[PDB]
Design a protein around this ligand. Structure first.
Ligand SMILES: CC(C)(C)NC(=O)C(c1c(C(=O)O)[nH]c2cc(Cl)ccc12)N(C=O)Cc1ccc(F)c(F)c1
Length: 93
């Protein structure tokens, strides 16, 4: 679980994360973390990266998301790990 105050942190995605956020129909350059996570979820859906067998795993190898996160897959239940992977791809305002 992520504290409410941290979800409202203002952030500026680096070029690659920004690129994939905009393909999902985020238009802007500055976000709250809550917004980044929403649009990442929408990206995963669009690209069908979530496990079809519903085992709470995203298979991101060989996709831009895998490149950014530096992992072939990850658990959607591990929110702090996800936040950390995202933070490495942005600058806090
Ligand atoms: C498309 C699918 C993979 C089924 N989405 C989700 O599982 C997903 C979610 C959301 C969401 O619900 O907005 N955003 C995500 C971003 C990433 Cl990188 C991974 C998962 C999510 N979640 C829903 O509860 C998990 C989640 C929510 C908020 C978080 F901060 C988080 F790290 C994971």
């Amino acid at each position: 679980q992520i504290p409410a105050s941290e979800q409202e942190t203002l952030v500026r995605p680096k070029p690659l994360l920004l690129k994939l956020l905009k393909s999902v129909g985020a238009q802007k350059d500055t976000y709250t973390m809550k917004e980044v996570l929403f649009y990442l979820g929408q990206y995963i859906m669009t690209k069908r990266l979530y496990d079809e067998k519903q085992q709470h795993i995203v298979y991101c190898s060989n996709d831009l998301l895998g490149d950014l996160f530096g992992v072939p897959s990850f658990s959607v239940k591990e929110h702090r790990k996800i936040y950390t992977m995202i933070y490495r791809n942005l600058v806090v305002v």
